[PDB]
Amino acid sequence: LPKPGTYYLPWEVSAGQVPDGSTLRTFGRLCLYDMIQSRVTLMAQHGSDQHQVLVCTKLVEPFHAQVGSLYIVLGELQHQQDRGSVVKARVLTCVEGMNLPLLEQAIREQRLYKQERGGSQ
Amino acid sequence: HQLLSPSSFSPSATPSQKYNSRSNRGEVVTSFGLAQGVSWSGRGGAGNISLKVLGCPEALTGSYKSMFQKLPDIREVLTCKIEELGSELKEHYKIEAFTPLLAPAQEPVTLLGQIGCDSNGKLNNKSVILEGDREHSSGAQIPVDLSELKEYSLFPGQVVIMEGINTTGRKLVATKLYEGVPLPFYQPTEEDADFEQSMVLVACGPYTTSDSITYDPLLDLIAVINHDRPDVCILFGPFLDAKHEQVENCLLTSPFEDIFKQCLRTIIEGTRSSGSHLVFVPSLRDVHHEPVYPQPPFSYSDLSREDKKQVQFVSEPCSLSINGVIFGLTSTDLLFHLGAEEISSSSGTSDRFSRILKHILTQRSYYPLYPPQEDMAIDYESFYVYAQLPVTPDVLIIPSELRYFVKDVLGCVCVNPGRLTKGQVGGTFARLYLRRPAADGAERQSPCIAVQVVRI
Amino acid sequence: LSNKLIMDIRRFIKKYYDGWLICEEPTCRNRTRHLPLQFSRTGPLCPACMKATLQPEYSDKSLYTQLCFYRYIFDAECALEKLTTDHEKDKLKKQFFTPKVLQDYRKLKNTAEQFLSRSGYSEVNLSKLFAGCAVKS
């Protein structure tokens, strides 16, 4: 059995605020599909800032690509020497039309409740 | 000696004397500028004429495949245009950031989106919805409340930046409304100022009466242009309207292509005496030409060597630049559509046509209306790649079915000569002046100085 | 006949570029021309039912089939080839079919084929298909 997948907004993982080898699930919008090297570069906006996450895909071929669309990625993170941070994909589904603010508020509320229950112990 | 032979094509036509009964021939219905005490004539193309087709970096030259369309292409084109214009407006007006459409916040925020009407019917102030963009809200749709709005003038497919309050994320109340920004004027170079003057005439179809193919207004216009001998002669389409009963019931004895070839031969032979430059712009009502806007120019392989230097065909729309003057050319009726499909409530009386003209100048689109008019076909890919305004044109030519008028907005001259034939009586045609002024002054001045519209 | 055929073809293409769409929900059956800007895993979303998608009212396949049908009735050569009985084919060709009739049939077929040349449905772009490979162009 594997470890569970905790949610993480793109900008935190972009800054490397998670330990190496952790399992995380995040979101973003695809920007490029490097065919030969099996690499995916998705992007997510934050005000005037744009953040990039590198996704290895060696475990989900065959895989259709939808340029300029949202995605959900779940897997493990490995801190490479030069490439930086890349997530090893285990499941990679596509969702469209789902509004970000509801999701962001949802994880914020869940984190708040978890911390509140953590105040008794 | 009618060079064209309507009797051969249809020997069952009786001439109509309503056009022949005209009594106000040669009357100038309206004018603008210094048109008093100035002779209205030309050199018949005996001077120096420069032609420059502008617009897309690769101006339309040939044909392209049409009957193949996919929805993601349409979405990509729409979102690219929306995001480009939004970014330009943000750079112009110093907007710090854009709030997502569905974000609920009590503090007023600024949202970017397209103007559309939810109702299937005509647009109205109680049926306005704002549609977002892919890069920020992925096709959001929120109703707009203009009750607090003071003045408004909107049409479907209008790119606006609007600031309001979104409490629950579903209902938005308008609190502000911005305005479009025109493209910078083209700057004439050293060579442009050298040209002193030229004569350009504007004409538009249909060149038939309600039920007569005798082409009497066509012959009279041919005689007028031959006598006047303008430097540049420009005639708009259609050269053969499909609304005629003879072509409706298929009563013609000659092929349509042959009929148009004979008409073009007639025009060339008639204009040979004048020896003036001929420019032909196709229209969406043409029969022999495929009706998808934009469309390739007409094809003619029988042009003589001598006449090749003065006869040309350009795509619709075209941006023809002569002697450093930009001409806005379109064979489509923007004004009628826009007037039929626009709603406004202004605190003061103002010209609706001027508002439409400033809107289309600001929207940076020849046909910014979306969805278009149910009487024509638009290829969205070709429209985006080929039908974008290069720069702000000094002159704009808009044939229309509405009332003839001449108006100037933001340094751009716009002419509405109207149809040359109205029912069974002649319409109006206009004549233009192009005098290059001194570019010494800081303020750019329109080289066009006078215009007169002569009734036919 | 040719002047009626050109009008008919213009009518078909005008109908095709109407852009009408219909909702896929059996209880909605919405009809609209405002194509939205939010897609899903399959395509545009119906702005009325918020659950189903939108499909074209008159797809390219029907248009191409109609044009092929128009070209079908003006190919006497294919009909002659399809004639299994050689003797009857020769008898029909000799008894009535002068070469001038064949020339007229070709003239009629020319106008129908004229619009077929610019049709993009029968044209495949090879650049898109193999664009993925980039090792050796």
From Swiss-Prot, chain A:
One GO CC term on file: chromosome, telomeric region
Effect of residue 117 to Q: 2-fold reduction in binding affinity for STN1
Subcellular localization: Nucleus; Chromosome, Telomere
Family affiliation: Belongs to the TEN1 family.
Assembly: Component of the CST complex, composed of TEN1/C17orf106, CTC1/C17orf68 and STN1; in the complex interacts directly with STN1.
Known function: Component of the CST complex proposed to act as a specialized replication factor promoting DNA replication under conditions of replication stress or natural replication barriers such as the telomere duplex. The CST complex binds single-stranded DNA with high affinity in a sequence-independent manner, while isolated subunits bind DNA with low affinity by themselves. Initially the CST complex has been proposed to protect telomeres from DNA degradation. However, the CST complex has been shown to be involved in several aspects of telomere replication.
Residue spans binding DNA: 1-121
PANTHER family reported for this sequence: CST COMPLEX SUBUNIT TEN1
The keyword Nucleus belongs to this UniProt entry's keyword annotation: yes
Main location as per UniProt: nucleus
InterPro entries on file: NA-bd_OB-fold (IPR012340), Ten1_animal_plant (IPR029146)
GO BP terms: negative regulation of telomere maintenance via telomerase; telomere capping
GO molecular function, one term: single-stranded DNA binding
UniProt keyword list: Chromosome, DNA-binding, Nucleus, Telomere
Protein name: CST complex subunit TEN1
Highest taxon of the lineage: Eukaryota
UniProtKB/Swiss-Prot annotation, chain B:
GO process terms (BP): DNA replication; DNA replication initiation; DNA replication, synthesis of primer; protein import into nucleus
Biased composition (Low complexity): 1-16
Reported modifications of this chain: Phosphorylated in a cell cycle-dependent manner, in G2/M phase.
Principal location class: nucleus
Subcellular location per the Swiss-Prot or TrEMBL entry: Nucleus
Alphabetized UniProt keyword annotations: DNA replication, Nucleus, Phosphoprotein
Note on domains (UniProt): The N-terminal 240 amino acids are sufficient to mediate complex formation.
Subunit structure: Component of the alpha DNA polymerase complex (also known as the alpha DNA polymerase-primase complex) consisting of four subunits: the catalytic subunit POLA1, the regulatory subunit POLA2, and primase complex subunits PRIM1 and PRIM2 respectively. Within the complex, POLA1 directly interacts with PRIM2/p58.
Family: Belongs to the DNA polymerase alpha subunit B family.
UniProt function note: Accessory subunit of the DNA polymerase alpha complex (also known as the alpha DNA polymerase-primase complex) which plays an essential role in the initiation of DNA synthesis. During the S phase of the cell cycle, the DNA polymerase alpha complex (composed of a catalytic subunit POLA1, an accessory subunit POLA2 and two primase subunits, the catalytic subunit PRIM1 and the regulatory subunit PRIM2) is recruited to DNA at the replicative forks via direct interactions with MCM10 and WDHD1.
Protein name, entry field: DNA polymerase alpha subunit B
Gene source species: Homo sapiens
Gene from which the chain derives: POLA2
Swiss-Prot record, chain C:
Reported impact of residue 56 to L: In VEODS; no effect on protein abundance; decreased DNA replication
Superkingdom of origin organism: Eukaryota
Residues annotated as signal peptide: none
Assembly and binders: Component of the alpha DNA polymerase complex (also known as the alpha DNA polymerase-primase complex) consisting of four subunits: the catalytic subunit POLA1, the regulatory subunit POLA2, and the primase complex subunits PRIM1 and PRIM2 respectively. Interacts with PARP1; this interaction functions as part of the control of replication fork progression. Interacts with MCM10 and WDHD1; these interactions recruit the polymerase alpha complex to the pre-replicative complex bound to DNA.
Functional description taken from the UniProt entry: Catalytic subunit of the DNA polymerase alpha complex (also known as the alpha DNA polymerase-primase complex) which plays an essential role in the initiation of DNA synthesis. During the S phase of the cell cycle, the DNA polymerase alpha complex (composed of a catalytic subunit POLA1, a regulatory subunit POLA2 and two primase subunits PRIM1 and PRIM2) is recruited to DNA at the replicative forks via direct interactions with MCM10 and WDHD1. The primase subunit of the polymerase alpha complex initiates DNA synthesis by oligomerising short RNA primers on both leading and lagging strands.
Miscellaneous field: In eukaryotes there are five DNA polymerases: alpha, beta, gamma, delta, and epsilon which are responsible for different reactions of DNA synthesis.
Similarity remark: Belongs to the DNA polymerase type-B family.
Protein name from the UniProt record: DNA polymerase alpha catalytic subunit
Residues of the full protein shown: 1326 to 1462 of 1462
